[PDB]
């Protein structure tokens, strides 16, 4: 048995929109995570022979964001780099491609992760090139058009499909708000008891003339529990889904180093976990909130696991309904799901979350001395991915 193992895993703090990382581009967040992941793996700067970083909103970053992040991290010029867009799942699909590249023998040491600066997403002029001709046009938010809106039902925010899911499942405004308060409570607790310290690499940001250490997640401490049940529906007249039971716009990155178990052992490197499998599921774009259920069932078949044998689940909290659908359809305890909080408290930097939730899962498995984790993420366009990890 020579499975692929994760030997290192780290994330930046997750900043709020126009918050802590307002003036930090995606490649600098990526560089911070990449540097840390390689130092934690006890590797030299030239030992990564495949690097794949998730990123959805690449407009205005310049050529090859992942290349900018890897070279900005101090890794050697010889490091092959790719930038990967599988929407909200980009950071996990990076792990899955890196995993397969290692199994196929194309690489011996791979860096996977993702990064997003939602703050630095620019505006777009679709008809600047060839001409508006006459009449008003649109100045398009890149984050909205290329990140948050469906491509088929044009202009339709993903929150509308989360509302369809609330209606189909009978998820009440109150039950969504309770899931969101549990996520917010857990994150504040985790932060307070230092349960994120082992997984975070701080950044230094230039603060006008001075410099600040950002070493903690910006959003859980700023949340107002009192306003949650007061908010207007966000996506539909007289709906249940709100800003507070949806994930927020966020800036962050995450990076993990993978290799064969035999290569970790040949390096004297203690693995965090073996990857025991991964799964890809797709259906209609308007059914994305339930897609994680499909991915996790395919993952149980591919691994030979059962749901009952899994200690911890991370299901990315794009909306409370995504977590609540998974609890209903996979018969999971809220006690085993998103135990340190989730995107409803921490944010959803779209290209990083798929990797971020795997970093959080690894830390949490270690902290409670548990064996088996599953991470799953729903994906714009109607997809989900899921990954099984096991501590040895």
């Amino acid at each position: 048995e020579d499975p692929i193992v994760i030997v290192s895993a780290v994330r930046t703090p997750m900043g709020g929109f126009l918050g802590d990382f307002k003036d930090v581009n995606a490649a600098t967040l990526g560089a911070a995570a990449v540097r840390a992941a390689v130092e934690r793996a006890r590797l030299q700067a030239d030992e990564v022979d495949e690097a794949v970083l998730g990123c959805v909103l690449a407009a205005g970053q310049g050529q090859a964001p992942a290349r900018q992040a890897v070279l900005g991290a101090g890794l050697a010029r010889g490091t092959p780099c790719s930038t990967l867009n599988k929407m909200c799942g980009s950071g996990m699909k990076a792990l899955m491609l890196a995993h397969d590249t290692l199994l196929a023998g194309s690489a011996g040491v791979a860096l996977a992760g993702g990064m997003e600066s939602m703050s630095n997403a620019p505006y777009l002029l679709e008809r600047a090139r060839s001409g508006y001709r006459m009449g008003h046009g649109k100045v398009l938010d890149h984050m909205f058009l290329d990140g948050l809106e469906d491509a088929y039902d044009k202009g339709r925010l993903m929150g509308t499909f989360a509302e369809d899911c609330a209606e189909a499942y009978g998820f009440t405004r109150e039950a969504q708000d309770e899931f969101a308060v549990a996520s917010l409570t857990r994150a504040q607790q985790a932060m307070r008891d230092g349960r994120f310290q082992a997984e975070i690499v701080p950044l230094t940001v230039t603060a006008g003339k001075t410099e600040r250490l950002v070493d903690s997640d910006e959003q859980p401490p700023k949340a107002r529990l009192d306003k949650i049940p007061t908010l207007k529906p966000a996506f539909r007249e007289g709906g249940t889904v709100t800003a507070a039971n949806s994930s927020s716009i966020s800036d962050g990155a995450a990076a993990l180093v993978l290799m064969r178990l035999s290569e970790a052992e040949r390096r004297g490197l203690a693995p965090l976990a073996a990857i025991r499998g991964h799964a890809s599921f797709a259906d209609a774009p308007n059914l994305f909130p339930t897609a994680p259920v499909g991915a996790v069932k395919r993952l149980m078949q591919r691994t030979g696991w059962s749901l009952g044998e899994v200690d911890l689940f991370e299901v990315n909290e794009a909306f409370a309904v995504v977590g609540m659908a998974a609890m209903r359809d996979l018969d999971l305890s809220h006690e085993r799901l998103n135990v340190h909080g989730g995107a409803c408290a921490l944010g959803h930097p779209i290209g990083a979350s798929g990797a971020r939730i795997v970093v959080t899962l690894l830390n949490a498995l270690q902290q409670y001395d548990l064996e088996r984790g599953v991470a799953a993420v729903c994906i714009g366009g109607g997809e989900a991915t899921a990954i099984a990890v096991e501590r040895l």
Copy 2:
């Protein structure tokens, strides 16, 4: 021996900038190529387990360009999609990931390729979000900023690094122009003798009320051979590199279907070729024009091939100097390199070219009844990929 085989391979015609496909988005070009590749593989809508499409300039396309192209082609909603940016090498890296996804056992049937509408890249406003405050600002061409300029020597076009290479190698104005004239001549002759017909899927384009059948490459017929020795240098005062010994901006797509030989045999599907290996190479961003030399040398080590056993080479003609460096440092006859012409005649739709040259290579190997091909592409950021294919 159960190698991964390419069972189908197709491209759109390559259009000129604001030409034949000015009104066709990237996902429509990708959809045309994906649809024909699936048809030529005799597959039904739900038989592609994994789709990866290269695309560099994703801004303004909406969520998940590869998902739009796959569903636009008529493939089922169950088809997992990813959009890949490895700059000029995107289309080849797509083949490489699909290849390793099959070998890893993560899929039975994969689709790879790339697509680029440089015509529909939008303009960006980097400071529209938080304000320009006062004084003029930039409206940034996404194609220039995110596709054509170096990220490190900010604003420097890749043609300046091509001029560095012309200086380092002593490639004269005349020798580069002769390479470009052989590329245009070969392409014009390939067109006239029908040597592109087997590899091209025509598109129907709607010119207002009229409809037009685009079934041939736009650029070779419009080439002014007489003007080539008369152009000014394009990148450097007193230089050698011009618009005619550089590739042009181009719109296009290409797609290929891969599977184990044993799966192709089970389906009664005659393979075009076995993939015998692939290699990635990276060095300093400003040395990109010679990166293919590293990629091809690394490819001979991994495959166990030698240069002399290769029948045909495709080296993407980002600039004539890229081909000429490869001919000198790999000791290749011009007669075995880019034998139907290359990007200097056809164009360089950046996210598609790394797959497009594999399509052209496979058809050329078939026409001359040859066994062994190498395709290599240089890449913004200082990289290159190469792939080895063998007809059985």
Copy 3:
């Protein structure tokens, strides 16, 4: 009796939107008209004491459009310039201010007119200064927002108020189309018989390497008489007003030189006509189409004229209904109104038209050896101006 006299009067041809003058800015059109007006008055560069030019859409032209046009014409730097916006009436209000500046003794020789490049009006970003923050925004056509739409019923085009007037007056689709056909016929015939030749200054336009002489009105020759009864309503579901019984977007300029009769006699300069009076009228913005009725009635009170003593009328054809309201409420024969055609055939370069119709009126009075003319123009914001001219 020492009345103010018009000694010269000239216009550019009127171009179609993005047509003949697509590449000519407003100040170049103004410069052509100013230069010929000064030449026809036999004046030298330093003999104009006051210049006022109408122009509505000044955005993106740089400082002081009228100053650019005056100096561009070759007039001396000593020439005081002002740019005037009274919407569709700018060109006439320029004549009115110049007229009163002479009578007041503030000048001996004044130049008035107007100029408009609707082709070169730019697009605006209303929130580029302080930021769009998040979500789509508007890129605003300066021509629409600042020229064509009501400021009070925000976004409402002036053609909706034209439809109100068609309803209030019972002007049928057929009757409006007949007015427009008489306007196109008269213009086409005026063109063919040379009846515009004395009033037009040709421009030389540079089409890349080629040069072209534009010496005739672009729009009347391109008019499809057959399509007029077939167009849809343009402003209201089930309405009567269309693109063909409305004026078109147009590029053009006009200029006139004024002075006391005694100054014209001192210079040996034969006047074209005496100004006998001018009137301003305003009412509710949504009644603009009938404002000329008020302006002309107020003009007969101030001059002591009656309608029956007037030989020719020019009422600017912003819409056919503007002419038809004037014909009904002023009891005017169609045979005495807009006898060489009007804006329905020629176009409506908004800042120029109020001066352009005076130029056409003066030439028409000369050709038919008639004495007395009235020009009137309706104005966005609910206004109108009219002027009385008499040949001696």
Copy 4:
């Protein structure tokens, strides 16, 4: 003797750029001044038969800014309105045209003034209409391109010509800074002793959820005397002209009511002053800082006044050098010039300053019981205007 008299005069406070009036458009500032001027003249809402308002930066305001201001003030629909651009002199040229319109008998009661929202000037896309085609372009600050930059030496700020004037006149950095400190001191004093109270109409601005009374000039209290001599030259390497010895960007409006003395007497209205003359001067655009000297000498000839007979001068402080040139060339005491401060302390809302300085001059003549004032303003494009007022 029946001269034109000013019966009323008022201004808004002058806001700083993105300051007090950040969210107040030009027509609302105009409306406040217009309303007050008409109430102070003891006129009904329908008694103004000519309204001319200066405004340079009309982009994005909608149709007919002056019409929006007049109707927003509550004046009757019957009030004729024009928007006037004579750059920095717009507000005084409005007074001069209104004056001549009254003398010519075209109107009996005229409203003149100007208004500018420099904060609400938008950005422009010159090639949005017909296309950028390829390569970066500019997003143009309307305020910079159409307000502050020369049109002939393209991109050249007016501060560069003020530096040429410093060099030609030997105006030292220290002498400029001293003029600026005197202007700042005088304004703070004037404000402190309520010497602006009689001339200002407050506005109420909505302050998030609340509402603020803005009744005082924003800029003099915020100025830092200590930083003045520390600032870097603003316009030329190792120059003398700075941000603090130049006027600042400002938001404000001013309005004055004019009529014949016989009409003020027939209404029982006490005039503030008779207008005894006006003058217009123009020369090269790069000599604008000295143009006021030309205007004031022509004004002395036209009025039959001499410089020695004038009690107070207002010369608009576009730059300290403008004030200092006038002191040198007209042999004027700083004691008689800009006695309550000037644009170096208060700001330069470009389309209003020409009227603003006349309001300040009238108040100051009353406060010191003096007879004769001169106001003069330099004008982009190389012009100046000047007006003589006399208390009776």
